[PDB]
Amino acid sequence: QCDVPPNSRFDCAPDKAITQEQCEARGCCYIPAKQGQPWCFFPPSYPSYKLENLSSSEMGYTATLTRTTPTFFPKDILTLRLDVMMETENRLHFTIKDPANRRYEVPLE
Amino acid sequence: APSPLYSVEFSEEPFGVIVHRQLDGRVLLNTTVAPLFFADQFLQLSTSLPSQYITGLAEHLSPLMLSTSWTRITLWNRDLAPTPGANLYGSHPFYLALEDGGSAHGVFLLNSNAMDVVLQPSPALSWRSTGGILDVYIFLGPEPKSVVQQYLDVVGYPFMPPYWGLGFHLCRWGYSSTAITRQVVENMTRAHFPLDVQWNDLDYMDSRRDFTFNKDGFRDFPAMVQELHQGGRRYMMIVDPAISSSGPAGSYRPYDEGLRRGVFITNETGQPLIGKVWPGSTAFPDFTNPTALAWWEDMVAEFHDQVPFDGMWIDMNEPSNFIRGSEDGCPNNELENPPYVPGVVGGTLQAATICASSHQFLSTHYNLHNLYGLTEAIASHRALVKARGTRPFVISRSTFAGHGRYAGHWTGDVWSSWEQLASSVPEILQFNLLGVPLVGADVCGFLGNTSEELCVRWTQLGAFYPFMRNHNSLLSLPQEPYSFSEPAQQAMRKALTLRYALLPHLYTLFHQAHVAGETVARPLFLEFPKDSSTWTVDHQLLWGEALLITPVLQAGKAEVTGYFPLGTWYDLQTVPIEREPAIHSEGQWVTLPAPLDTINVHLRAGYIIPLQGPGLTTTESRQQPMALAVALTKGGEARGELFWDDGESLEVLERGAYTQVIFLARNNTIVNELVRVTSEGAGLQLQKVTVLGVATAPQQVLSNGVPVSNFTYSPDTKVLDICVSLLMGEQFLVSWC
Ligand SMILES: *[C@@H]1O[C@H](CO[C@@H]2O[C@@H](C)[C@@H](O)[C@@H](O)[C@@H]2O)[C@@H](O[C@@H]2O[C@H](CO)[C@@H](O[C@@H]3O[C@H](CO)[C@@H](O)[C@H](O)[C@@H]3O)[C@H](O)[C@H]2NC(C)=O)[C@H](O)[C@H]1NC(C)=O
Ligand SMILES: *[C@@H]1O[C@H](CO)[C@@H](O[C@@H]2O[C@H](CO)[C@@H](O[C@@H]3O[C@H](CO)[C@@H](O)[C@H](O)[C@@H]3O)[C@H](O)[C@H]2NC(C)=O)[C@H](O)[C@H]1NC(C)=O
Ligand SMILES: *[C@@H]1O[C@H](CO[C@@H]2O[C@@H](C)[C@@H](O)[C@@H](O)[C@@H]2O)[C@@H](O[C@@H]2O[C@H](CO)[C@@H](O)[C@H](O)[C@H]2NC(C)=O)[C@H](O)[C@H]1NC(C)=O
Ligand SMILES: OC[C@@H]1[C@@H](O)[C@H](O)[C@@H](O)CN1CCCCCOCc1cc2ccccc2c2ccccc12
Ligand SMILES: *[C@@H]1O[C@H](CO)[C@@H](O[C@@H]2O[C@H](CO)[C@@H](O)[C@H](O)[C@H]2NC(C)=O)[C@H](O)[C@H]1NC(C)=O
Ligand SMILES: *[C@@H]1O[C@H](CO)[C@@H](O[C@@H]2O[C@H](CO)[C@@H](O)[C@H](O)[C@H]2NC(C)=O)[C@H](O)[C@H]1NC(C)=O
Ligand SMILES: [Cl-]
Ligand SMILES: [Cl-]
Ligand SMILES: [Cl-]
Ligand SMILES: [Cl-]
Ligand SMILES: [Cl-]
Ligand SMILES: [Cl-]
Ligand SMILES: [Cl-]
Ligand SMILES: [Cl-]
Ligand SMILES: [Cl-]
Ligand SMILES: [Cl-]
């Protein structure tokens, strides 16, 4: 589970200095660098979101994404909506949003 | 076959978006590589990268190709003199990734929150944003130039500058009177240095306030600017966003009227957030408020009625604050003290700016900060259209993705150092990839004191910045062209003369940027992506497809080694303007002679470039006869084009108020093909045709079937120089044998 090549380790403690015990308590892997590369990193089993109810539209796809285990950040949005729009032959566009709340979006024409 | 260039599939658990290139099955995006995080103030989406070669993610002082060695790139608009590892004035959350074989794709995250982008050597990337949503565009190319165009299809094609905006601009902090400012123009003119645009910094203002001029050194400010116009020049001056809040009520209309109309960013109690900038206490306009836009339009139009300036230099629009947050500090809340602080200089979102929880019309400053400069540029573009009725010219410090649709950029407070001269090339290329082709650095450098040698080399390279301005700090030694030794003045004059000769070509390149999402200054890898030796080249640049510039970027050098892609490259020194003549490259590094008086410029075989005769302004140069430089392939072929309009009207392409001509060389003939001919362009005189790569002396040269008045052939350089009397807008045939 923690046998991840050093260059493929994604940081499980981007937010603060962490001890081995705190890292393992987050459900992460603790392997010091031999000399930067994160010492605390996600195993492949680290809880993410699950895709549910993938559906086809004329534009592309829609789905629900569900997180069941909280992260170490406050205010996880546990239910997300995925929208995939096949806009042109060379432009693919997808959004991930909170279906229960309008969130800030950049004004664009 | 009708089908997208991409295919998409999804991982169920853990969730991921997988995007393949359909043609070769290459994995471009794969977000399964790391968990998806989506919390109120923390979004993280990761992907594999197709290669170790990735560019974008402005604004930072770095090589064009970003390091994948555990690099944290922070997007949080910040007033800081360019230095590596630091969040600078702008934020552009777009990358272009190269693929083995020379295809490419691009990714845009449409998110304006403070963010870190983390690159690792697997290779992989993580977007880490502090708010908003994940709004992701993938552009399939496959050519790097197509990726850029596809990105600009979403964020906006570059605006078309006025022709005069491509001339030389001269500024400093410290021209403390109209008398001194006039002497700059006099001194440039006496020494035969072209100058289209005279600038002032905050020297003009009354007590360092916008929309004022002092009645000491600048009492006759209106007359100075009218006189510049009488001589065929334009005038630019600095505008700050911050508005003096401390003056007696009714004594300072920009503040008094801004207060009446509620144009300012407000705090918790709904009063204007007060910071400290140049005039002392200041309020900050909210350029997301439609009423602030109307107010800004009015302040610019009213000031333009006093002093007819030709554009706006918008500085300190991060927005920059001399104190942290406000005079009243900032409240303790989750926006001021978020759970994840990206790698910003100073360790807080408040450093050198305003409170994150401050109120704007559309949202909090937390969400809108990275758009502050862009919103001011949009407001200023609109203000200048309404005030002047011709194309706006806005040069902005702070930028965001899509900035180039409205304005240009300069790279800020660069040191007068050989390292910053060198660093300016990748940075100008990067802004072109991001759709801000009107970009340059302060020629000879801003901070500290330039040397004469540095200022020669910087003027040489800077003459190939699409935006060319020499600007200088208050305590610096003078660095105007005329302030140097005679030999240095000659080298600087030659650089400006060559730029002015090339302006019809540079203007045509801006036309292609505006109508087709093309780059103006472009890295070799955009033009020759299938040659992997080009991928790391960022100390050379192209103008468009055909003009390769190889500058000296180090002290004490009399040669330079540059990469030459496969083909023939003619030394532009063989073209007459008022050492091998050809480099025959297999795709290789070539050491070129480069004495102090020289910058290497080569013209690609197969291209024709239009040139125009000399002038100390574009008002003068645009009246001169034109010339063609025709760079033949071994097979005798070349192609080029000219776009011409009145240089400053709005809606030219929509109204059809332009001339467009194609030039073709084939079988010892040169012709024009008339795409569009109108009154703007009709009387353009062609008086000289210079043909490069003519293997044998011709016996005769004809223009429209009659032996020409005069021609010269040089057997040593293989150049045929032809005198003609032709019109760009009427079909001609030039032939030799
Ligand atoms: C994945 O989607 C399923 C199915 O949802 C249904 O079909 C879709 C195409 C949409 O039209 C939906 O609006 C529609 O509900 C979801 O499972 C469904 O969950 C709902 C809500 O919990 C269930 O409703 C219940 O129905 C029973 C009687 O049949 C009532 O007694 C309850 O009061 C309640 O209304 C529904 O039965 C259930 N349907 C199935 C087939 O299981 C599912 O929640 C969704 N997954 C996620 C994570 O969103
Ligand atoms: C929101 O912004 C307003 C300004 O638009 C802030 O107003 C300022 O409030 C402070 C008190 O908190 C005032 O300071 C006081 O000034 C008087 C003398 O002028 C002095 O005698 C007091 O001891 C004190 O220093 C300050 O004058 C005032 N500024 C202005 C321009 O009126 C307000 O505090 C801001 N609110 C928050 C929560 O940040
Ligand atoms: C930039 O140069 C100025 C001025 O330098 C002096 O005058 C020039 C003509 C040149 O001959 C120099 O060698 C001279 O020393 C610097 O401002 C001076 O700074 C020194 C030391 O800090 C101070 O004692 C002088 O009085 C200043 N002189 C003036 C006219 O202001 C400035 O420091 C230089 N900037 C940098 C970053 O090196
Ligand atoms: O418009 C000037 C300049 C442009 O030329 C440049 O191109 C552009 O990128 C930056 N601007 C603003 C510079 C702000 C520096 C203040 O630095 C502390 C500072 C310096 C300074 C220097 C001279 C006099 C007064 C001050 C001052 C007064 C109060 C508070 C701070 C200061
Ligand atoms: C997308 O990335 C994911 C995760 O790195 C890859 O899935 C893993 O592939 C390895 C090797 O095939 C398997 O042993 C793992 O079980 C997979 N992990 C998961 C989480 O499924 C996946 O191969 C990549 N997809 C493509 C098309 O490259
Ligand atoms: C314009 O050039 C003039 C002439 O060279 C400059 O005036 C001289 O400046 C030096 C100071 O550097 C004085 O010692 C001389 O007395 C001046 N000579 C004359 C003939 O007036 C002038 O400063 C230049 N102005 C600008 C703004 O560059
Ligand atoms: Cl430990
Ligand atoms: Cl924790
Ligand atoms: Cl690299
Ligand atoms: Cl005018
Ligand atoms: Cl609103
Ligand atoms: Cl909001
Ligand atoms: Cl090489
Ligand atoms: Cl080399
Ligand atoms: Cl030269
Ligand atoms: Cl003729």
mmCIF file of C-alpha atoms in Angstrom, chain B residues 372-508:
data_model
loop_
_atom_site.group_PDB
_atom_site.id
_atom_site.type_symbol
_atom_site.label_atom_id
_atom_site.label_comp_id
_atom_site.label_asym_id
_atom_site.label_seq_id
_atom_site.Cartn_x
_atom_site.Cartn_y
_atom_site.Cartn_z
ATOM 1 C CA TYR B 372 -8.167 43.512 -9.912
ATOM 2 C CA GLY B 373 -5.696 44.550 -12.641
ATOM 3 C CA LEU B 374 -7.709 42.932 -15.441
ATOM 4 C CA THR B 375 -10.963 44.702 -14.286
ATOM 5 C CA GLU B 376 -9.090 48.059 -14.239
ATOM 6 C CA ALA B 377 -7.728 47.333 -17.763
ATOM 7 C CA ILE B 378 -11.302 46.558 -19.041
ATOM 8 C CA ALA B 379 -12.582 49.780 -17.353
ATOM 9 C CA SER B 380 -9.674 51.823 -18.848
ATOM 10 C CA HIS B 381 -10.106 50.293 -22.352
ATOM 11 C CA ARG B 382 -13.837 51.329 -22.293
ATOM 12 C CA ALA B 383 -12.966 54.783 -20.798
ATOM 13 C CA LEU B 384 -10.416 55.483 -23.565
ATOM 14 C CA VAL B 385 -12.780 54.313 -26.387
ATOM 15 C CA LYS B 386 -15.474 56.668 -25.079
ATOM 16 C CA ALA B 387 -13.046 59.581 -24.465
ATOM 17 C CA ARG B 388 -11.091 59.422 -27.754
ATOM 18 C CA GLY B 389 -13.273 57.428 -30.278
ATOM 19 C CA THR B 390 -10.163 55.518 -31.548
ATOM 20 C CA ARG B 391 -8.361 52.284 -30.482
ATOM 21 C CA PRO B 392 -7.302 52.335 -26.795
ATOM 22 C CA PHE B 393 -3.686 51.895 -25.635
ATOM 23 C CA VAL B 394 -3.522 50.514 -22.045
ATOM 24 C CA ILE B 395 -0.259 49.159 -20.521
ATOM 25 C CA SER B 396 -0.976 47.348 -17.227
ATOM 26 C CA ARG B 397 1.255 45.965 -14.475
ATOM 27 C CA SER B 398 -1.155 43.357 -12.978
ATOM 28 C CA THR B 399 -2.846 40.889 -15.358
ATOM 29 C CA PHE B 400 -5.009 37.742 -15.424
ATOM 30 C CA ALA B 401 -5.897 35.257 -18.162
ATOM 31 C CA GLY B 402 -7.676 37.122 -21.022
ATOM 32 C CA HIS B 403 -5.863 40.433 -20.273
ATOM 33 C CA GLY B 404 -4.564 40.615 -23.874
ATOM 34 C CA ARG B 405 -8.107 41.151 -25.221
ATOM 35 C CA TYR B 406 -7.977 44.620 -23.543
ATOM 36 C CA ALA B 407 -4.383 45.695 -22.880
ATOM 37 C CA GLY B 408 -0.661 45.166 -22.939
ATOM 38 C CA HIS B 409 1.850 44.541 -20.102
ATOM 39 C CA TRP B 410 5.372 45.464 -19.029
ATOM 40 C CA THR B 411 7.326 43.085 -16.756
ATOM 41 C CA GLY B 412 7.720 45.604 -13.883
ATOM 42 C CA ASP B 413 10.697 46.607 -11.699
ATOM 43 C CA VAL B 414 13.511 44.610 -13.372
ATOM 44 C CA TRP B 415 17.104 45.424 -12.278
ATOM 45 C CA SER B 416 19.553 46.958 -14.763
ATOM 46 C CA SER B 417 21.496 43.640 -14.809
ATOM 47 C CA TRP B 418 22.723 41.162 -17.457
ATOM 48 C CA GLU B 419 20.688 38.449 -15.633
ATOM 49 C CA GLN B 420 17.412 40.463 -16.030
ATOM 50 C CA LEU B 421 18.220 41.279 -19.728
ATOM 51 C CA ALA B 422 18.544 37.494 -20.257
ATOM 52 C CA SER B 423 15.403 36.713 -18.146
ATOM 53 C CA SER B 424 13.311 39.190 -20.247
ATOM 54 C CA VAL B 425 13.406 36.853 -23.302
ATOM 55 C CA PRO B 426 11.591 33.860 -21.715
ATOM 56 C CA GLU B 427 9.152 36.269 -19.981
ATOM 57 C CA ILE B 428 8.204 38.117 -23.253
ATOM 58 C CA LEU B 429 7.774 34.717 -24.963
ATOM 59 C CA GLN B 430 5.617 33.453 -22.049
ATOM 60 C CA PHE B 431 3.213 36.456 -22.270
ATOM 61 C CA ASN B 432 2.874 35.863 -26.066
ATOM 62 C CA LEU B 433 1.845 32.197 -25.355
ATOM 63 C CA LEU B 434 -0.730 33.674 -22.887
ATOM 64 C CA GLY B 435 -2.351 36.019 -25.501
ATOM 65 C CA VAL B 436 -0.634 39.239 -24.249
ATOM 66 C CA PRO B 437 1.625 39.864 -27.274
ATOM 67 C CA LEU B 438 1.905 43.602 -26.493
ATOM 68 C CA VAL B 439 4.592 42.970 -23.814
ATOM 69 C CA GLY B 440 8.142 44.137 -23.056
ATOM 70 C CA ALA B 441 10.584 44.912 -20.250
ATOM 71 C CA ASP B 442 11.907 48.358 -19.314
ATOM 72 C CA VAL B 443 14.688 48.773 -21.901
ATOM 73 C CA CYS B 444 18.135 49.102 -20.125
ATOM 74 C CA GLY B 445 16.328 48.039 -16.894
ATOM 75 C CA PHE B 446 14.354 49.948 -14.233
ATOM 76 C CA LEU B 447 16.123 49.549 -10.820
ATOM 77 C CA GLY B 448 19.727 50.617 -10.215
ATOM 78 C CA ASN B 449 22.153 52.067 -12.766
ATOM 79 C CA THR B 450 22.599 50.656 -16.256
ATOM 80 C CA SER B 451 26.054 50.456 -17.868
ATOM 81 C CA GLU B 452 26.643 51.715 -21.397
ATOM 82 C CA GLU B 453 27.441 48.155 -22.615
ATOM 83 C CA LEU B 454 24.253 46.708 -20.978
ATOM 84 C CA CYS B 455 22.110 49.550 -22.452
ATOM 85 C CA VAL B 456 23.497 48.865 -26.001
ATOM 86 C CA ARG B 457 22.692 45.109 -25.733
ATOM 87 C CA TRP B 458 19.331 45.813 -24.026
ATOM 88 C CA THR B 459 18.324 48.345 -26.787
ATOM 89 C CA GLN B 460 19.355 45.785 -29.447
ATOM 90 C CA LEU B 461 17.224 42.981 -27.920
ATOM 91 C CA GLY B 462 14.496 45.402 -26.695
ATOM 92 C CA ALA B 463 13.970 46.655 -30.292
ATOM 93 C CA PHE B 464 12.464 43.127 -30.780
ATOM 94 C CA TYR B 465 10.100 43.397 -27.785
ATOM 95 C CA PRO B 466 6.585 43.855 -29.286
ATOM 96 C CA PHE B 467 6.138 46.725 -26.758
ATOM 97 C CA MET B 468 9.379 48.791 -26.659
ATOM 98 C CA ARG B 469 9.741 51.333 -23.810
ATOM 99 C CA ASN B 470 12.885 52.593 -22.054
ATOM 100 C CA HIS B 471 11.847 53.456 -18.457
ATOM 101 C CA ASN B 472 14.009 54.303 -15.448
ATOM 102 C CA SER B 473 13.690 54.710 -11.657
ATOM 103 C CA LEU B 474 13.822 58.022 -9.707
ATOM 104 C CA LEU B 475 17.342 57.613 -8.212
ATOM 105 C CA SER B 476 18.923 56.019 -11.353
ATOM 106 C CA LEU B 477 21.550 57.595 -13.657
ATOM 107 C CA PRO B 478 20.004 58.734 -16.976
ATOM 108 C CA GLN B 479 19.641 56.094 -19.713
ATOM 109 C CA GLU B 480 17.968 57.883 -22.712
ATOM 110 C CA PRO B 481 19.708 56.896 -26.001
ATOM 111 C CA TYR B 482 21.247 60.415 -26.401
ATOM 112 C CA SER B 483 22.900 60.189 -22.866
ATOM 113 C CA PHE B 484 25.606 57.669 -24.055
ATOM 114 C CA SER B 485 28.913 57.819 -25.980
ATOM 115 C CA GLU B 486 28.786 58.408 -29.763
ATOM 116 C CA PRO B 487 29.551 54.720 -30.614
ATOM 117 C CA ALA B 488 26.804 53.552 -28.181
ATOM 118 C CA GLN B 489 24.378 56.154 -29.686
ATOM 119 C CA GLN B 490 25.162 54.775 -33.203
ATOM 120 C CA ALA B 491 24.365 51.170 -32.067
ATOM 121 C CA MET B 492 21.103 52.315 -30.341
ATOM 122 C CA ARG B 493 20.085 54.374 -33.440
ATOM 123 C CA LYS B 494 20.684 51.355 -35.722
ATOM 124 C CA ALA B 495 18.439 49.198 -33.449
ATOM 125 C CA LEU B 496 15.596 51.793 -33.536
ATOM 126 C CA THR B 497 16.048 52.332 -37.356
ATOM 127 C CA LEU B 498 15.678 48.580 -38.028
ATOM 128 C CA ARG B 499 12.610 48.330 -35.741
ATOM 129 C CA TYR B 500 10.998 51.312 -37.588
ATOM 130 C CA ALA B 501 11.824 49.720 -40.990
ATOM 131 C CA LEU B 502 10.096 46.484 -39.820
ATOM 132 C CA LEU B 503 6.941 48.207 -38.408
ATOM 133 C CA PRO B 504 4.671 47.213 -41.374
ATOM 134 C CA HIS B 505 5.666 43.555 -40.693
ATOM 135 C CA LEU B 506 5.287 43.888 -36.886
ATOM 136 C CA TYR B 507 1.826 45.496 -37.453
ATOM 137 C CA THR B 508 0.828 42.619 -39.789
#
